[PDB]
Design a protein around this nucleic acid. Sequence first.
RNA 1: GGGAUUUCCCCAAAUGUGGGAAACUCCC
Length: 131
Amino acid sequence: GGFNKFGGPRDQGSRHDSEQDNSDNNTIFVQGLGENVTIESVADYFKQIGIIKTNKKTGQPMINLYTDRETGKLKGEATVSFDDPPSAKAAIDWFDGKEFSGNPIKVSFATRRADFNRGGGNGRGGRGRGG
RNA sequence: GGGAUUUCCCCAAAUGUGGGAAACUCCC
């Protein structure tokens, strides 16, 4: 039960009187988007709370719209990373329960799903020392 | 010693913040 396996902003501490109480959680998860949404829509929809974090090589904001594995189209889930941690907590308390394009949506903290089953992320080849 | 900037390399489905390496300048 609860928000997630980390419990959402439930154990965050002073998050009831402050928009901080986080630092390693500048990311938020979103639900209810629908198929009408895209990277430019989410980032342009969330940026009003604070700046969306940019990827270090793709140049786009750090977003991805998730899809149904049973049909291969938008599930209505997405994940938006904020460039600032206090903007993520505010965007959760704010966007959760309102609409996005006419349909209702939800928002919560986000934490890498891979660290809970896929063993988390992994390194890859490239340049090396003395190169 | 630390922080910021720049550059280079790699798979994609899995669903929620990728890693490694090099250089210069600036700030503490």
